[PDB]
Amino acid sequence: MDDKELIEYFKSQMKEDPDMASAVAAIRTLLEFLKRDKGEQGLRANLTSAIETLCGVDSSVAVSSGGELFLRFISLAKCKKIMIERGELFLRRISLSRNKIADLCHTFIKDGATILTHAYSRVVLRVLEAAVAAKKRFSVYVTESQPDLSGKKMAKALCHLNVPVTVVLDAAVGYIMEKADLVIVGAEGVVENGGIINKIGTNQMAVCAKAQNKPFYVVAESFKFVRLFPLNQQDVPDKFKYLKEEHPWVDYTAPSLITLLFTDLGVLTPSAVSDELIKLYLAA
Amino acid sequence: MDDKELIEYFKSQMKEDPDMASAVAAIRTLLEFLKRDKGETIQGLRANLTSAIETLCGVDSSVAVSSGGELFLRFISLSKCKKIMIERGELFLRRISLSRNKIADLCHTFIKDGATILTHAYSRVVLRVLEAAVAAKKRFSVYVTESQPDLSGKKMAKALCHLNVPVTVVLDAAVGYIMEKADLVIVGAEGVVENGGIINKIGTNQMAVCAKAQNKPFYVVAESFKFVRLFPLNQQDVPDKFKYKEEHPWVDYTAPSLITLLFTDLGVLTPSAVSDELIKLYLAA
Numbered sequence A: 001m002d003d004k005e006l007i008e009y010f011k012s013q014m015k016e017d018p019d020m021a022s023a024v025a026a027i028r029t030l031l032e033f034l035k036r037d038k039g040e041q042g043l044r045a046n047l048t049s050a051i052e053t054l055c056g057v058d059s060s061v062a063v064s065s066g067g068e069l070f071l072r073f074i075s076l077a078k079c080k081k082i083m084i085e086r087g088e089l090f091l092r093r094i095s096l097s098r099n100k101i102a103d104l105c106h107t108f109i110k111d112g113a114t115i116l117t118h119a120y121s122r123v124v125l126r127v128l129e130a131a132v133a134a135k136k137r138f139s140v141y142v143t144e145s146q147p148d149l150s151g152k153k154m155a156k157a158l159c160h161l162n163v164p165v166t167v168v169l170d171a172a173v174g175y176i177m178e179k180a181d182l183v184i185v186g187a188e189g190v191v192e193n194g195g196i197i198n199k200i201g202t203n204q205m206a207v208c209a210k211a212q213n214k215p216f217y218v219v220a221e222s223f224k225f226v227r228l229f230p231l232n233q234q235d236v237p238d239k240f241k242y243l244k245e246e247h248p249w250v251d252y253t254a255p256s257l258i259t260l261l262f263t264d265l266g267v268l269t270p271s272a273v274s275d276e277l278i279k280l281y282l283a284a
Numbered sequence B: 001m002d003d004k005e006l007i008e009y010f011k012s013q014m015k016e017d018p019d020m021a022s023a024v025a026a027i028r029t030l031l032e033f034l035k036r037d038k039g040e041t042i043q044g045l046r047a048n049l050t051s052a053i054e055t056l057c058g059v060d061s062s063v064a065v066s067s068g069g070e071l072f073l074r075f076i077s078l079s080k081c082k083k084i085m086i087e088r089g090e091l092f093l094r095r096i097s098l099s100r101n102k103i104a105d106l107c108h109t110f111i112k113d114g115a116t117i118l119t120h121a122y123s124r125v126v127l128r129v130l131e132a133a134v135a136a137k138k139r140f141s142v143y144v145t146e147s148q149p150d151l152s153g154k155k156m157a158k159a160l161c162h163l164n165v166p167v168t169v170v171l172d173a174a175v176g177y178i179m180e181k182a183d184l185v186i187v188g189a190e191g192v193v194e195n196g197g198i199i200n201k202i203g204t205n206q207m208a209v210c211a212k213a214q215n216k217p218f219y220v221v222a223e224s225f226k227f228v229r230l231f232p233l234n235q236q237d238v239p240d241k242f243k244y245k246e247e248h249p250w251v252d253y254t255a256p257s258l259i260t261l262l263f264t265d266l267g268v269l270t271p272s273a274v275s276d277e278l279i280k281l282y283l284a285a
Helices: A003-014 A022-036 A042-049 A061-072 A083-105 A122-132 A150-159 A170-179 A202-211 A270-281 B003-015 B022-036 B063-075 B085-095 B099-105 B124-135 B152-161 B172-181 B204-213 B271-282
Strands: A114-118 A139-143 A165-168 A182-186 A196-199 A216-219 A250-253 A260-263 A266-268 B116-120 B141-145 B167-170 B184-188 B198-201 B218-221 B251-254 B261-264 B267-269
Touching (some): A022 A042, A061 A083, A083 A122, A114 A170, A122 A150, A122 A182, A122 A216, A139 A150, A150 A165, A165 A170, A170 A202, A202 A216, A202 A250, A270 B271, B099 B124, B116 B204, B124 B152, B124 B184, B124 B218, B172 B204, B198 B204, B261 B271, B267 B271
Parallel strands (some): A182 A216, B116 B184, B141 B167, B184 B218
Antiparallel strands (some): A260 A266
């Protein structure tokens, strides 16, 4: 394919199917890029990563961690061009992640709990559905999440499952925290120290949850494990972030503010991520 | 060779060459055990037996021997023609043999002329760094802790004396007292942990904490084969198999936040960027 097609293909993956994660949408356009791309050799390896950056259209961290993991595990090899069969394999495997997670979580959501969440998260929606429809009664609190009000969107989705839900202002997280039992949040990216990059506002929610001793749980797919090691907001690359005005789309939450992470790799405490991440990136 | 035999070989390996890091002696006996070992039907069966002695080389309970050992076994891994593991094993040793000196020179920039350097115990890697610096004709002074219970800092003071370098031996209880007189501290590591922190001879943690409070840079010098797959966040998370032999642990742990920079054979690194090197390391396969 060519740049044009690439983006057009990518954008038309999440638009007709928002259900899908950007990361997953990125490797799909990448399978087609590869497939639809014929005629090489290292040209393939280079022309493929030289366009994976192009999918940067989505400043999403997952596009970056996803692309690498996908790329790394198909490069192991025009007969060698059977990397495609590994791509279908990989895309076939990552499309089971949400589920392993919603399963590793049915236990922590106890009957009668009050969950506090931030913005929209597909994985979070899944976990709660697999809990409600799974004979559990709870209520949720979610921040409206400026600037795209994705929190309201989340709310509506929760209402459709007839789960009691209240929307509050981002400014009201420390106000509503005392009436929460636990907070569940998704991640755009899990960094090498067990911390996470997520929709701006995630950080302060964690700081408040900790001061009130409320467990903070993160629910996210392993293909979100990215090779970055930030220690503060300043370390997060601008590339993922975007009288004066500052509009960071995401922020970083240190691992000490996280209780547990639920991944298709199993439930992990922040200090276990680094070893998993490597034991993940290095797989044949 | 067997256990009794392995240990014998491993000890004499270091007796004959005291200047040799315990981690290199261990991997050398593993190579020797690789050659000397035969009787296949172990295509991957002895890939276990060679581990059944990775442990045995616990006659020296240092993390180095472990992270190094795992590196070796990881590197020499790809028909009994497979004893190409041996020649790979010889390539590896050949490789991790230019580490000390490479670090020594890839580190001369930071040894200012006229400086007062405070170090702890004995580290052959720190010794090569200063030797390099002296040959480079830099004039500096050194303070070293005797480092109980084996007093290995005194052996270090002698080595520096026979190098005509001004060195003063102090009590371990004296690091707080002497800190103000130093420009920087330079220490070695038995193991570099996944978060950029390190495991080193007991006493290291204190020095790092005392150096932080007076803003004296804290530098670590260590070979890459010491990058170990561990992520401790406190003394408790360090395994006892690396501590013993309270009851007198031989090593304490120093958080990354107490480390200014690490000078490795892969170059100078900030503690935070270390975990990525471990991946980049193994990616070398």
